[PDB]
Structures are given as structure tokens and as C-alpha cells.
Amino acid sequence: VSILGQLKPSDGSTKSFKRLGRGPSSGLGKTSGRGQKGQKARGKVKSWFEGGQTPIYKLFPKIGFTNVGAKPLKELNLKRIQWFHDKNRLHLQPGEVLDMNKMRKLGLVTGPIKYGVKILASGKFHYNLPIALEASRASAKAIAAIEKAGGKFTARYYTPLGLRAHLNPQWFLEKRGRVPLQARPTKRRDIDFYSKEEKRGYLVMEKDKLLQDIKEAQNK
Amino acid sequence: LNPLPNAAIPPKYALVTVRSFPSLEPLTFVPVPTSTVAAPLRRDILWRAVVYENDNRRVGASNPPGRSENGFSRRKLMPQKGSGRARVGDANSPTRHNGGRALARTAPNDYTTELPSKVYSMAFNNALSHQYKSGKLFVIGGEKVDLISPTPELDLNRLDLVNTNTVEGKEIFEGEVIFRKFLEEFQLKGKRLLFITDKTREGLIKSSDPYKQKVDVIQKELVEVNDILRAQAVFIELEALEYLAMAHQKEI
Amino acid sequence: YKQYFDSLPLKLKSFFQRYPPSIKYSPVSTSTKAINANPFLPNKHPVTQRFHDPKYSLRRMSDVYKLALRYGVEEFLPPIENTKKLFFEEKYNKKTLMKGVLLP
């Protein structure tokens, strides 16, 4: 005979749903688990109600602001890149700076890189890779570990569109026959960050034109 | 000294015989991988696939009228007190005999459940493997592959009957007769059959139509787990089987 | 060559049909009655002395220009000098940074 009339679920998968209002010996008899006679018996008191004491959520003071300008950043710890190399997963060539295009492509960080990647230092001891990295930013300790390894970090600015283009340049080419140009940092805070040598920002490390223009303006 | 003494490497290819259609004649072996055609028969996975498919299939046309849907007036039939009878509102109540249903379902009852794609693929493989084990998986081909024994003169390598549409002498036609002869030969007249084609074999389906109640001709894309398992013997094209394998292979 | 031209996107092809490259259209705003009147610029009507809006509104013009850039057919389109829009690499290079960027 066909198997189709002898298939069961795996043991522990299914259950019988508790069926109310269906006789006394069932257990869930006349009252059907409701108790006896109150409001909840016939209706439902507000789930977050509290009788009269200030509804807790109101008792506590309101706290904080939602920094709309914030661009939360994902975290690719040094430990992970090491796991990829030892697993022979980080497939790079002499050079091929490990950017975010390669990063997500390789599968170290994956899912949704919306705003960028920060490189943190959770396996800085056993990190020994002389490859060059490039991300939104890195932790100071992580940077130091990279330097020790014989590597080279560069904090690179990416607007959300520019980041997207970096990650998936072929899509833009397919759509429009042209990948979009990478934007300059318009914001003051961004400019300041990438102008820091301590952060290994690209504007100082590559000696950018924007920074020079700003200096000229200041002079004049 | 020896850490895992009984470790070993599993077998990776099962031979399926490639046949000519009208008469199921062995032309070649073809080693299909063990994952497609000889997986361990996990019933739970198979069950999951079947139930999900059944749920997807659902029409869900149950439409009893609730007290709103039901078409009485909203008027109070007897005044609250001073009637000498029980309290009543409008005539639509579930409590009364002509009134609408309590907790009534409505139009388009959506019964669609979800399954992970990988699980579904595994189930598909599993069903195929079970069929192979049973001896109910007839792979028909020989066009692409290199043969051992040559194809017969009156058979052909694809899954189809010749000159089905031709009907000159009498109302009876040849493809139907051939099909009947085939059925007689392999002792599967009343048994459920499942012809998994690659491209639309119009002549084959015409031949089948007499035995439409038991024979189900399906494309490579539209074939289901249910269809495979219900079948008493599946007749799959080599190319179609390859395609299915490719579809439901675990990715690397 | 003809087949390659035909293979061009629709909007661009339509533009070429209705404003062909044999006519050297003006860089500056002109009379609306003129033959060399640029469809991207706002041309003045000679009687009323009112600036008519460009025959190709600004979005459409931009799209056309981007299409031309894609297929390398820029110079056959009439000039977009006096329309304020720049595009892509030229825009990037020629622009001055904002006062806020240079002088916070």
C-alpha cells in the first residue's frame, strides 16, 4: 500500500488544543476556565490595566530621545576574520583590501549592512593577518592589533546610497549602465572623524582634496 | 590510539535503469546520487510536506451566515419585561432556530500554511527514495546518455505515444491501444499511475484520458510530494528526474 | 548602425525623432517661433513677451540626458548649458562645496 495512509508527525511535535465548554469530566466544563462571575468571566479587563494605581508605564518618568541621525553600525570582531582564515574561508588575493563588498560577499558579516561596519577587537591576541582592512571605523585596540599583525586599516566614509553601491556595484550597472560616485562627507562631525589620524580616517590617510579645500577656505 | 574505530565513508550513487517507454526495456544504468533516490525514509518530514500541500490546496468556501450576514430586521421581537416569556432581541440570534450562526466563518477561508524550502526539498527527495526502494520508480530515457543496449524499433526514449492524433479507419486510435497493451503487460490496470514528463506530451495525455481516474500525467515543475506518494508506480523522464534532483539538492 | 540606433531606449529615440541633430539648437533662450529653439530652455514668446515653459520639462530632459550618457549620444542632443542641471562626473568636479562644509 502507499505510505500516504500511514504518516505521523514526529513525537513531541503536535498537541491536543484545550477544548472548553464541553462537559464536566472534560475538566474545562461549564465555566470553561473563566473562574466565576466577574468581568474577565464575560469580557476582558485591559491587558495593561492596573485597577487604579497609576499604570506603571505612567508612574516612571519619560526618558531619552531617538537620535534620528544615528546610523547604527554592525560589528565584525577580529576573532571572526581569524575564524574565516583558519577555515580558509577569507578567500583573498595578495592585496584585495578587505572592504565591505568583499566582507558581506565572503560572508563574514551578512544580512543587512544598512549604515556600515565597525571592526572590534574580541580576538586581538590570536589575530595575525597581514591583509589590509577597510570599514566604516575600527576600535583603537583592533587597529593596534591589525598594525601589529602587519596589516593596514582605513576608516572609509559611506553615505547609505554610496555604501549600497559599494556592496552591490553590478546591480547599478545593470539598471543604469553606471555605478554612482562616492559622496563627500557633508556633515561636520563626519568630516572631523575622518580627519583624525588616530581613527585612521581616509581623508588624512589618503590626503584628500576636500580637507585641503577646507584648509584653503579657513586661510582665506 | 584509535579514536573512532567504526567511522567510515557512506555510499554515494544508486543505479537506476534507463528504459524505453511503451515496453519498459533496460537500456542503461544511470548512477543517481544516494541523497535523491536512497535517503533514509523519514516519515515525519514526509508528513509535514503532505499536510502543508493539502493546506495549500484548500478552497475554503465555508460561508455560513452570522447574525449580521443573516437577513432579519434589527427590531426587538418582544419588550424586555411584561411579556411572560424569556428575553429576546432581534431574530438573528444563534439561540433561535431561524437565526444566524455563532462564530460564523466567512468567504475565502485562508488555510495556507508555510514550510521551510529546505524541509520541503528533503521531503521531496525522501518520497522519491521511498518509491525507488518499493520498486515503483521507472526512469525512461536514453536520448542524452550513452547507451549499453540499443533502443527498440517500435519504442522511443521519451515518454510519449506515436500517432495518437491520427484516427482514419475507425473512431478507435492507436496510442490508446498501445497504452492498454502496456497496462496489460505490466499488470497495473486498476493501479494508480503517475507520468512525470519534462515537456508537454499531448499524445500521452490523450492516450491516458480513458484511464484518467487512475493515471495522472504531470510536468516536471508541477509534480508534488502527494502525487509521488499516492502513485502505485511513477514513470519519470530521465531529464525530468535530473531536473528534480537539481532542484531539491542540498546546496554547497 | 541603423540597427544599433533602433536598439536605443524608447524615450531617447522619440526625442531624436522630434528634435533631430541636424538642427543646431541654441545654447541661450530664444524666440518660441524660432527653428533652433532649445526644448530644454524656457523660450520667450515674441508677441506676448512671456517665457514659455521648456518643451521638455526638467525631469524628462534629465532622463533623456542620462540615456544619452549611457549610450554615448550626448552631443547629438541640444545643449544643456543654460539649464542649471549638471550630471554625474562633471557635476561632481565643477561644484563648489557648501558654505557650511568649508566654513562651519
Added chain:
Amino acid sequence: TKFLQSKSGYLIPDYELTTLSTPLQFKRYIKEKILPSANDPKLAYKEAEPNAI
């Protein structure tokens, strides 16, 4: 195996073919499965009632 099938009249399943590595093994299988059913038609395996005794 094809020759054996042709002479026999019966079909040896694909899985079985894959498994059995010798002619002797094939013979043994045949003796086990097909032969008794051929001898006695009431003893044969029925599809609708697979757990018959």
C-alpha cells in the same frame, strides 16, 4: 541483470540491482522473493493489504 530479467519474465527492482554484488546473491534473492509467490498465487504479495499473513 538485464539478461536474467528477460529469461525470468520478472523485474528485479533497481535498489536490489544496486545492492546485490554477485550472481549467487541474485539467485538467492530470486529464491526468497519471487519463486514462492509464483508457486502459490494466494501466497503472493497484495498491494492494498501489505501486512497480510
Added chain:
Amino acid sequence: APIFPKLEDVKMHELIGNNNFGKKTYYVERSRTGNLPVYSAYKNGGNKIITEIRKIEGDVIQLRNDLQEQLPFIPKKSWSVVMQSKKIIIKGNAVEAVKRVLTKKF
């Protein structure tokens, strides 16, 4: 690259019913990314930790016995082999030890 290889290149030992894989032997296939299928699992609301071992082909009982022999420090009781899916559950977070034991062969 080809899903079904040609009849010539496939050896006899590669086929099913050869080399005796069913009788008292096993295999433990690595994941897609190429790691040992041994996982911590925090059941009953983080209260019950257990170590799960997946992707086992062949005789699971034998494999379990071999692992017990390798790791005598874990008790005999705490080795629940669920037969429907063929995976062997251990009570503690004994993942790393299991991995170490397996690595050498799988």
C-alpha cells in the same frame, strides 16, 4: 558539476549495498560552511542546557558508545539518542569536547 555522472567513472564501492556501511558503522557529515554539527541548546527557558549532535549517517548507538569511551568523564546516563531524527543529546555544555573527539575522523 554534472548531477548524474557517467556509468564508467562510478566505482562499485561507491554504490549502495557495498562496503557494509549499515552494520555497526557510521558517518557524521559537516555543515554547509564546513564545521562539526555539535550545538549547545538552552531548553526549558535557559534552565536546561544540552549538547546536540546532528547529521549522523548509519548506526547512532555505536557512535554514542564510541563517544562515551572517548569521554569517560561524562556519565553513562546522560546520553539520550533520539532515534527518529538520529541525533545524540548530552546533558551538559559538552560541545567542545565532542568536537575535539570527532575532528580527527570527521
Added chain:
RNA sequence: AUAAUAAUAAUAUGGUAAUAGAACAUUUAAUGAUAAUAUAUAUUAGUUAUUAAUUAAUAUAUGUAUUAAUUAAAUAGAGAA
């Protein structure tokens, strides 16, 4: 190292509201032999630690079980208004 049943010992096995576990009847869908020597239904008399099913006798239909069984769906069970 498992299960099924059976052993010996001990401990427990009242119960409203309520929590948890496990079963059965009914109806539909998937798979599905069988046959008026049967099935379905009813009364009675039995048997099975027994809501149930089954034996027999009998009446009635029906040349027949969506039948046993596994799932999955329930408009799934009424001395309480």
C-alpha cells in the same frame, strides 16, 4: 541503555474554582482491500474492567462501505439559559 506484557517490594491514587496528561463517539479530506455467506440500522440476549466496540437471533433496507487504520479539518458530543 529500548519497548510489550508479566512478577516481587514500597509510596500514592476525595475534590469546587483551576493546572496538566491521555483517550473515545460524531462529520469531512488524503491513502484503501472487502461483499446481500456482505454491509448499514434497530430490539433483545450475550462478551470485552464496558462513554465504546463485538457476538448471536431477529426486522428493514442496500449488490453496497471515504469501510479498518494514519494523519489532517472540524458547525466534533446538551437535563439545564
Added chain:
RNA sequence: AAGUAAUUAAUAUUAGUAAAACAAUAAGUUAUAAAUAAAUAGAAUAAUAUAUAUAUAUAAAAAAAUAUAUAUUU
């Protein structure tokens, strides 16, 4: 004649998959770091908290809390 349906969120158990999953064109969601009102801060410089991470504070510390390191990542 009466605990039901749709859209959510959470917990359990099982099954697949697994440092990935889902989905596969992309895009996204969840987890992969803890935080902090928030900012550019982020987990051993010689090993178990006597290390380090963030928050208060601060020259750096100590001090609260929470978190992180003991062949192979969770």
C-alpha cells in the same frame, strides 16, 4: 444553540538548517555584543576577575551594576 477567525507579539515542544537562519533577483527580518538618555566609546598589553567593556566619575585608577575572555568560535 455557544472559546472562533484575521493580523501581531511572546513561551514551549518537535522537525529542518546552523554561526548562521529566512528568503533567494534583489530587499528585508532575527541572531551574530554588552551597553549608554546620546555622541566619534567597545570587551586578557602575561590569564578568571585581582584582566578587560560600557555607564557615573576621572590624570589614570578604585567604587555599583551589567557584560567579556579558562583542539576549538556562540
Added chain:
RNA sequence: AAGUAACUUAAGGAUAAGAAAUCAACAGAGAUAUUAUGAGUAUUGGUGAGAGAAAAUAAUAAAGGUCUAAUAAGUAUUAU
């Protein structure tokens, strides 16, 4: 609750919308519509109850751009 019920009027096979004084952000995109995602997120609220986008990314979708106006003033705006 809710611009919902209800009442009125009028038009067509549909109608409505539709070719940017739109979004955005120093990059850019290119009519409208419907759906998913963004996202119960920003925003908002006797800061209670509650209400809640857009960009962008995809689906759907058609030939989808196109002159008809001598270019638009009691209009832009503003105050209320």
C-alpha cells in the same frame, strides 16, 4: 468612534490618479495606481486612550509619454 453610517447630487464603464514647482541630499531618482518590505519606525497624543508616514527595495502592470496651451494674478505669498 469617523469623514464611518446615514441623507443629497452627479458621471462612466469603470471612475479616480497620472507625466513632477515630486522626493531627496552634495549621491541621486524620474507619471499614476495596488501590494509586500521599510515599520508599528520617525512623528504624534487630557505625551492617556490611542493614532502613524516617506525615502528606498522589490512585486503587479501598459506603447507609456504627450501637446491641447500664443504659459497663466486677484493667483504666488501674506494675515487671519
